[PDB]
Coordinates of C-alpha atoms and ligand atoms in Angstrom, one line a residue:
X8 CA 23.4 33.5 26.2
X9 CA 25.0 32.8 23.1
X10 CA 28.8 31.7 23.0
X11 CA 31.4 33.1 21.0
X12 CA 34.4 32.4 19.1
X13 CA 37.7 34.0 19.6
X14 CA 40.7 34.2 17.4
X15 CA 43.6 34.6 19.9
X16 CA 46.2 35.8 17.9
X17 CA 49.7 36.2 17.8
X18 CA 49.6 40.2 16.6
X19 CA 45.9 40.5 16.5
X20 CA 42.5 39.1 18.2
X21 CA 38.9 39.0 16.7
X22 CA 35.7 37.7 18.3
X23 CA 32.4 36.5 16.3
X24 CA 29.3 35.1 17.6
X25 CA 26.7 33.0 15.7
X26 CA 22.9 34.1 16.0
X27 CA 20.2 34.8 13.7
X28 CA 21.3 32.4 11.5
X29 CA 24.5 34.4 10.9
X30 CA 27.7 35.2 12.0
X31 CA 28.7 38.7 13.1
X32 CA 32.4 39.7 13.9
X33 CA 32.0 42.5 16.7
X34 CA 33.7 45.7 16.8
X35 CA 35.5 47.2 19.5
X36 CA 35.4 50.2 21.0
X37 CA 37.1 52.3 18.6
X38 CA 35.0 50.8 16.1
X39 CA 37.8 48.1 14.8
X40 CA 37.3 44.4 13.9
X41 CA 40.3 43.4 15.3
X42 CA 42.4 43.9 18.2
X43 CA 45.6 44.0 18.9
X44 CA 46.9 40.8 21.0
X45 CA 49.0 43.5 23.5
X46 CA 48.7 44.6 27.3
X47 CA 50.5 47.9 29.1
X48 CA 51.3 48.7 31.9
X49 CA 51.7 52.5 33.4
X50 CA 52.5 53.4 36.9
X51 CA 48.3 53.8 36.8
X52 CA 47.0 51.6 34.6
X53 CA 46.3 48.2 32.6
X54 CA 45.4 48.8 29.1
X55 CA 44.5 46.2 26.8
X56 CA 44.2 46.0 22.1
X57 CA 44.8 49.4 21.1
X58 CA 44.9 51.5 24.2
X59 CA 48.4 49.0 24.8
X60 CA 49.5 49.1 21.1
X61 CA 49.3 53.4 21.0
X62 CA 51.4 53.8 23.6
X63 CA 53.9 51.3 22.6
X64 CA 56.2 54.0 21.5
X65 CA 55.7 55.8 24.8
X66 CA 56.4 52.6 27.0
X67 CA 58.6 50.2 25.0
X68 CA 59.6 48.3 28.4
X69 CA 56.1 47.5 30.0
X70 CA 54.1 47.4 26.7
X71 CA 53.8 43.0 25.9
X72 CA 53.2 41.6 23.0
X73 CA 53.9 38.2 21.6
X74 CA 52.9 36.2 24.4
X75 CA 51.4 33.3 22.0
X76 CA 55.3 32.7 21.6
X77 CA 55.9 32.2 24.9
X78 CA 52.4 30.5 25.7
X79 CA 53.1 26.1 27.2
X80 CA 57.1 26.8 26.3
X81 CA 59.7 26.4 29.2
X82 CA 61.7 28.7 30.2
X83 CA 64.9 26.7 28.6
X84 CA 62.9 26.1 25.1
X85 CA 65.3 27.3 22.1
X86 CA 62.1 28.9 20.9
X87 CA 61.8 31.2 23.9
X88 CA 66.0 31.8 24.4
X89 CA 65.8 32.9 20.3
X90 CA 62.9 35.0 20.6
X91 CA 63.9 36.9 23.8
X92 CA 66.6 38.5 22.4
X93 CA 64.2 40.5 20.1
X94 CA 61.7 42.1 22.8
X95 CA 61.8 45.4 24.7
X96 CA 60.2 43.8 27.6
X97 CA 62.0 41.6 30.4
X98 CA 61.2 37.7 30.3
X99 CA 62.4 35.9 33.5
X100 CA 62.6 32.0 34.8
X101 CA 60.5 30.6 36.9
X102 CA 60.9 27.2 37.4
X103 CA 61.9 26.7 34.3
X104 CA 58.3 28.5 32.9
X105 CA 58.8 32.3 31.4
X106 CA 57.3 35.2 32.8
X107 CA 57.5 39.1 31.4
X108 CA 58.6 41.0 34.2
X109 CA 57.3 44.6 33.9
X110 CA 56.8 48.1 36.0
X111 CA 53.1 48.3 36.9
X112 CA 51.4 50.8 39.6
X113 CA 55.4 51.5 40.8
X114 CA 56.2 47.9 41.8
X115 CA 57.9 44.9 39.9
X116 CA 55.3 42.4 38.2
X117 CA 56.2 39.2 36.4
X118 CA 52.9 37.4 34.6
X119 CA 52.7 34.3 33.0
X120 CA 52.0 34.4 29.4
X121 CA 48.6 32.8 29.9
X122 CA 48.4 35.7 32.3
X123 CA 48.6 38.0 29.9
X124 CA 46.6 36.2 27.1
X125 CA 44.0 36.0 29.4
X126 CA 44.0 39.6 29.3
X127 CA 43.5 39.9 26.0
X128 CA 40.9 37.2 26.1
X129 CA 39.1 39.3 28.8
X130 CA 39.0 42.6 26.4
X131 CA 37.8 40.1 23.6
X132 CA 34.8 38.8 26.4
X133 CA 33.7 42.3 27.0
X134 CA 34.0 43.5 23.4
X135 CA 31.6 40.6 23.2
X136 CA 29.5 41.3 26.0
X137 CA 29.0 45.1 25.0
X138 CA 27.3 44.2 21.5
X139 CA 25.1 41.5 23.3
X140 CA 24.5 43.2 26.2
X141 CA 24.8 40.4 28.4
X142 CA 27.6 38.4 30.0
X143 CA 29.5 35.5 27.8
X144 CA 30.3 32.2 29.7
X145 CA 31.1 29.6 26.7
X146 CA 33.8 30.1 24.0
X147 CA 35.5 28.7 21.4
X148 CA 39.1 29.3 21.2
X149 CA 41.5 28.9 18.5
X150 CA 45.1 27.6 18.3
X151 CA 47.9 27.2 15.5
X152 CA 47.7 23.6 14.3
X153 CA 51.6 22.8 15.5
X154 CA 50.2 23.7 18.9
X155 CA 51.1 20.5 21.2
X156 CA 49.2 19.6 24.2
X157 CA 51.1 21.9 26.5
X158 CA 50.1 24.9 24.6
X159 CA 47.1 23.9 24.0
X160 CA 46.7 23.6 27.6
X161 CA 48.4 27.2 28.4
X162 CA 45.5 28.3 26.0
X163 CA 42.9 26.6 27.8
X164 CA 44.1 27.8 31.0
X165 CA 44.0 31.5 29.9
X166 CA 40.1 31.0 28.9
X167 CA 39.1 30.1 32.3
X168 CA 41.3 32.7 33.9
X169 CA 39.4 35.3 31.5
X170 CA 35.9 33.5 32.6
X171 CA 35.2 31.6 30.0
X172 CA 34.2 27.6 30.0
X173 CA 36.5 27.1 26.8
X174 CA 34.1 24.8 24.8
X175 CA 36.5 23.3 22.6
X176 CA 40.2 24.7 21.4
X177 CA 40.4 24.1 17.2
X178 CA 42.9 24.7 15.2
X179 CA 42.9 27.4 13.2
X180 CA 42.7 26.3 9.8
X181 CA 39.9 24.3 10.8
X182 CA 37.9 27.0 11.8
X183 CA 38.5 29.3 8.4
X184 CA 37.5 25.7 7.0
X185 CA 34.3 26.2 8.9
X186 CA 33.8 29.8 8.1
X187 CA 33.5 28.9 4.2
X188 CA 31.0 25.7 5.0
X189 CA 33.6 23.5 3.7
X190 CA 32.8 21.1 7.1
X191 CA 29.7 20.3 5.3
X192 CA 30.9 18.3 1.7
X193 CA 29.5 14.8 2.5
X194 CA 31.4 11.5 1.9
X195 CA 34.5 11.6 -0.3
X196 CA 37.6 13.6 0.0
X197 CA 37.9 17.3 0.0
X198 CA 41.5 18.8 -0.3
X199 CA 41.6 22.7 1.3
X200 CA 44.4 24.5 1.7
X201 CA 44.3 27.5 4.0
X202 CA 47.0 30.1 3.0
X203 CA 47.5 32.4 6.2
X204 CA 49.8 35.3 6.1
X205 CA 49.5 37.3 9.3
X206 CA 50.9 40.0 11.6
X207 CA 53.8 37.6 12.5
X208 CA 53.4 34.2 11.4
X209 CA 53.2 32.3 7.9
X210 CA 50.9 28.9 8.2
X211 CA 50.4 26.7 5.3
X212 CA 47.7 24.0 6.3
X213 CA 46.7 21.3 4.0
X214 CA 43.1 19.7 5.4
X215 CA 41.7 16.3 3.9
X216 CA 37.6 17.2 5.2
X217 CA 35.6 13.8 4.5
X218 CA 32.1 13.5 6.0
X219 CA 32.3 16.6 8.5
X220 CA 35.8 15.0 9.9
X221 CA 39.3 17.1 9.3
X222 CA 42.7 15.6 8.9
X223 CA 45.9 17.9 9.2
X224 CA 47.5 16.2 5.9
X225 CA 50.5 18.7 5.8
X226 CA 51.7 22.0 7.5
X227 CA 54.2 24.5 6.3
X228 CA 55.2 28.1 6.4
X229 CA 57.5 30.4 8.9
X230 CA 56.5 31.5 12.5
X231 CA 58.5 34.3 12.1
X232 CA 57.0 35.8 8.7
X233 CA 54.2 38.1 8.1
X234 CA 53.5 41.9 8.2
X235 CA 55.5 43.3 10.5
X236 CA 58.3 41.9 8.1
X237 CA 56.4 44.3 5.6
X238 CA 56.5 47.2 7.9
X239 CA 60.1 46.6 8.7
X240 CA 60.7 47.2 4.8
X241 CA 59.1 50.3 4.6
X242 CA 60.8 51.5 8.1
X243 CA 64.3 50.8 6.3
X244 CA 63.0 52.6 3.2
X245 CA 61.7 55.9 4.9
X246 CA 64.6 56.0 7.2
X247 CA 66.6 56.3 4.3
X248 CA 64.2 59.2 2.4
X249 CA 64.7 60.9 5.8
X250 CA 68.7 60.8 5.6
X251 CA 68.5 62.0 2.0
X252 CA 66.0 64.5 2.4
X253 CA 67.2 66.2 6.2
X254 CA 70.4 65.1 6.2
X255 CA 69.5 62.8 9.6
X256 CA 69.6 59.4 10.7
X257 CA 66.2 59.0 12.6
X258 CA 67.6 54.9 13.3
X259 CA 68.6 55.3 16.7
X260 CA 65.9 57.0 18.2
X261 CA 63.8 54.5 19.7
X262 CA 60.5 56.5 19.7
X263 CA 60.8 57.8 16.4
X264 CA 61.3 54.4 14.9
X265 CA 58.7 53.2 16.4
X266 CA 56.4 56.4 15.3
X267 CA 57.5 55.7 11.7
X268 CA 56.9 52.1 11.7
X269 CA 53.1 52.7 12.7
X270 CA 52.4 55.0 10.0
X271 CA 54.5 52.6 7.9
X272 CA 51.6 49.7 8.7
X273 CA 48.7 52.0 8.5
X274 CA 50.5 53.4 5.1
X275 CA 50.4 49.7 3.9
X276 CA 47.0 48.8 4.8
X277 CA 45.9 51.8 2.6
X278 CA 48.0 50.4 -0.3
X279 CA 45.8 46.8 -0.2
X280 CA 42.9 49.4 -1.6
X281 CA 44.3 52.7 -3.3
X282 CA 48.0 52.4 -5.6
X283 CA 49.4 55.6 -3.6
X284 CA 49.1 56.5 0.5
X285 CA 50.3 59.3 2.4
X286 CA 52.5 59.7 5.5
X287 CA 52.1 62.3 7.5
X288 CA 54.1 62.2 11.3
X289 CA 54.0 65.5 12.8
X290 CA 57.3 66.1 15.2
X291 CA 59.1 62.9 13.3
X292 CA 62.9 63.8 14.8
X293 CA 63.9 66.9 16.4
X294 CA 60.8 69.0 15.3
X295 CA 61.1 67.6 11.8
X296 CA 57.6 66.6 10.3
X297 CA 57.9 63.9 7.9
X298 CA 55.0 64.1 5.3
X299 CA 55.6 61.7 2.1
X300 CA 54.0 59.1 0.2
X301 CA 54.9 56.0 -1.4
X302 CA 53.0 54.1 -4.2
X303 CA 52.4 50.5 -4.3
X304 CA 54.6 49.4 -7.1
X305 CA 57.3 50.9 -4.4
X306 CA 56.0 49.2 -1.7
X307 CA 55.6 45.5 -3.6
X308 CA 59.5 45.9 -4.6
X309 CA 60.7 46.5 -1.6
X310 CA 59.0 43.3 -0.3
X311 CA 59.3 41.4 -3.4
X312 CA 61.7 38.8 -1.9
X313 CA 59.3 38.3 1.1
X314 CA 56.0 38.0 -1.2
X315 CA 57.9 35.5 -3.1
X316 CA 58.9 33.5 -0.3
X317 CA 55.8 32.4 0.8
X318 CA 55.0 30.1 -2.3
X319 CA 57.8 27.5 -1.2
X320 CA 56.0 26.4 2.1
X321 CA 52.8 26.0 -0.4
X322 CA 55.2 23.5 -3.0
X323 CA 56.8 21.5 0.3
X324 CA 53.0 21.1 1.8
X325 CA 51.9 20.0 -1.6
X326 CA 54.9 17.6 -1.7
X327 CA 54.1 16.2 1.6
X328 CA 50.6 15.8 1.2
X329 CA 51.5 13.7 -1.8
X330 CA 49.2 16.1 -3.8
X331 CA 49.4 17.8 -7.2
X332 CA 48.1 21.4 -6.9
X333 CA 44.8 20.4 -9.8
X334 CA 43.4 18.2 -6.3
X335 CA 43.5 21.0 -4.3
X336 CA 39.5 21.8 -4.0
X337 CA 39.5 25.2 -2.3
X338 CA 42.2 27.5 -1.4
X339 CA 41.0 30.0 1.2
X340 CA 43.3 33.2 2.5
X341 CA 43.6 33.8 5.6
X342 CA 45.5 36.9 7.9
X343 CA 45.3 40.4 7.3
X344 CA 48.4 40.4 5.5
X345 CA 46.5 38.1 2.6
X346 CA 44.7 41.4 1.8
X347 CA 47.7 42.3 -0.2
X348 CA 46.8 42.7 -3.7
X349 CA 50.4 41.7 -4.9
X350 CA 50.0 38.4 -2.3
X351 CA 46.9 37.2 -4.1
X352 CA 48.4 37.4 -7.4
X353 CA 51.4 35.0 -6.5
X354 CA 49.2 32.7 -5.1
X355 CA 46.7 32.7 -7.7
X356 CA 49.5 32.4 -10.6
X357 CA 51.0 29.6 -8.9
X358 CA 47.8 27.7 -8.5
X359 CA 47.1 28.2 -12.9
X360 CA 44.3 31.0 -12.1
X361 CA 42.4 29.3 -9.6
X362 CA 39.5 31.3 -7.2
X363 CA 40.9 32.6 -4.1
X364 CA 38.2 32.3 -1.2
X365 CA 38.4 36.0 0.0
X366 CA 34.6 36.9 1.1
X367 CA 35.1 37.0 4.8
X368 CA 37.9 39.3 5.6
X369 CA 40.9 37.4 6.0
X370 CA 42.0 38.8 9.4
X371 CA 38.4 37.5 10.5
X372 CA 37.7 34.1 9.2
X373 CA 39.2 32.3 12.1
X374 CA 36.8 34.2 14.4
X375 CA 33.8 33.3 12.2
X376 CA 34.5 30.0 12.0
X377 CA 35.3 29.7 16.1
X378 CA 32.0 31.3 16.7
X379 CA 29.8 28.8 14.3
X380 CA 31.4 26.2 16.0
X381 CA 30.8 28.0 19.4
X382 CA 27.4 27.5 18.4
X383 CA 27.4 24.2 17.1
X384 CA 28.8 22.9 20.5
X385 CA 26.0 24.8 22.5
X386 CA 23.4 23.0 20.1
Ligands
ADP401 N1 44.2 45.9 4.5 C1 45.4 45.4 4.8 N2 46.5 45.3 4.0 C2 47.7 44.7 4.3 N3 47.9 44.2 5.6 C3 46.9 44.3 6.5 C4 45.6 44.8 6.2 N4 44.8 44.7 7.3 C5 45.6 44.2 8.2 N5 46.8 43.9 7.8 C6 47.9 43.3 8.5 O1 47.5 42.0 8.9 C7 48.4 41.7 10.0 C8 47.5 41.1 11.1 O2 46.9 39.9 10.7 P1 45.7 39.2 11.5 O3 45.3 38.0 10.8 O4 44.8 40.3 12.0 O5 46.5 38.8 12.9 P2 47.3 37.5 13.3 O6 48.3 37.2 12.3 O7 48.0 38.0 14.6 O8 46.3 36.4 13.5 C9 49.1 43.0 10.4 O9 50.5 42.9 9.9 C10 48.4 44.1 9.7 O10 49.1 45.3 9.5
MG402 MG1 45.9 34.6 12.7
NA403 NA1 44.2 37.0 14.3

């Protein structure tokens, strides 16, 4: 059986497995790439990646998400008493560990957050397992490079809970490393820096890679940047048309929000590709259908502040790394949010015109590279 990489991400998931010589990122059942890193549950059932995410609106209180923030922290961790006050769903103490305390099948449930990563890790297994058509045993699983040992460990631990024999967790710059060859260079010094913009987290990882052998030279960024910043922009923006144009303020009601802000990220995703997208939300607010569009000039000024902002993490890494940006070898992009026409451009400007690598979809080159190291490790 071959083993598999999986990209356990803080907003979204991907698994690839290496065979034939190539790497192939597998879809899910609704024929996506990716999978969103949530679980629900119903008074009937468990539903994990986008069965939890569509019914988010729907269930606000038993719907988790975000359980990579919680993932090796204690209970008492700043991290965790900040982050709380943001989510719709319970997190409790237990001995000094979190747990998200939900409804499920009638009764009161509090899971550990490796617990619920496992769940995701599970679907991600049996995503796997349906394009193989066998049963996967070995992975490789992935972790942010400021990961220390305890959530490396909590990471770990969800893997076997899952079913998997966790072959190695890397971190995951290294793998997108892996997923452009750059592991293979020979002796002498090759400067990468991996530019990852995702659903919910900013990285900026500076890699020395001499002989096959990575060093973490310098990390930068924000954990609490990425697209659902982007989303949020466009939420404020159509909340507004909505006032304007019904005379209503749509900001209160919990569903609708939520209703808007996920034609807001699908809206966005369309704007990476086309310079004008459509919304179109049936029942928006009181019977009120909301159908609009926005172009991407809009949509790039509304989140020019927030495009912008991601260029100082790449000066302070530079700084710290003691590197001028002309010895930077590669720059690779990585996150979905990287897709983002208006994202490139910063970074290429601010690296003097230099090639972006951008062949393997960003939202999957952690995955690709997990899975040829999957393989590696299983010889
Ligand atoms: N084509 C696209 N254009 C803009 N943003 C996108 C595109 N595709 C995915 N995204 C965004 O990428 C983010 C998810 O990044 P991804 O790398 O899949 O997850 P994670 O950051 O959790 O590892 C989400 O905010 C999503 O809306
Ligand atoms: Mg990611
Ligand atoms: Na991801």
């Amino acid at each position: 059986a071959a083993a598999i990489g999986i990209d356990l991400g803080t907003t979204y998931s991907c698994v690839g497995v290496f065979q034939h010589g190539k790497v192939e990122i597998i879809a899910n059942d609704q024929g996506n790439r990716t999978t969103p890193s949530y679980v629900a549950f119903t008074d009937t059932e468990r539903l994990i990646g986008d069965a939890a995410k569509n019914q988010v609106a729907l269930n606000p209180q038993n719907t988790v998400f975000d359980a990579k923030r919680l993932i090796g922290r204690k209970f008492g961790d700043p991290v965790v008493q900040s982050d709380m006050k943001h989510w719709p769903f319970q997190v409790i103490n237990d001995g000094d560990k979190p747990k998200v305390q939900v409804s499920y099948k009638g009764e009161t449930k509090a899971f550990y957050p490796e617990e619920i990563s496992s769940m995701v890790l599970t679907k991600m297994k049996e995503i796997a397992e349906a394009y193989l058509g066998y049963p996967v045993t070995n992975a490789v699983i992935t972790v942010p490079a400021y990961f220390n040992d305890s959530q490396r460990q909590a990471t770990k631990d969800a893997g076997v809970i899952a079913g998997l024999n966790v072959l190695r967790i890397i971190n995951e710059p290294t793998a997108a490393a892996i997923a452009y060859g750059l592991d293979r260079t020979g002796k002498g010094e090759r400067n990468v820096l991996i530019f990852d913009l995702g659903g919910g987290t900013f990285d900026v990882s500076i890699l020395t890679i001499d002989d096959g052998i990575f060093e973490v030279k310098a990390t930068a960024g924000d954990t609490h940047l990425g697209g659902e910043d982007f989303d949020n922009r466009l939420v404020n923006h159509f909340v507004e048309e909505f006032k304007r144009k019904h005379k209503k303020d749509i900001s209160q009601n919990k569903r609708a929000v939520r209703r808007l802000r996920t034609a807001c990220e699908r809206a966005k995703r369309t704007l990476s590709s086309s310079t004008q997208a459509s919304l179109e939300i049936d029942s928006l607010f009181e019977g009120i259908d909301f159908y609009t569009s926005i172009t991407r000039a809009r949509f790039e000024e509304l989140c020019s502040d927030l495009f912008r902002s991601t260029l100082e993490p790449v000066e302070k890494a530079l700084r710290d790394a003691k590197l001028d940006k002309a010895q930077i070898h590669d720059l690779v992009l990585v996150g979905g949010s990287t897709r983002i026409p208006k994202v490139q451009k910063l970074l290429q400007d601010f690296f003097n015109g230099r090639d972006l690598n951008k062949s393997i979809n960003p939202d999957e080159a952690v995955a690709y590279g997990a899975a040829v190291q999957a393989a590696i490790l299983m010889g």
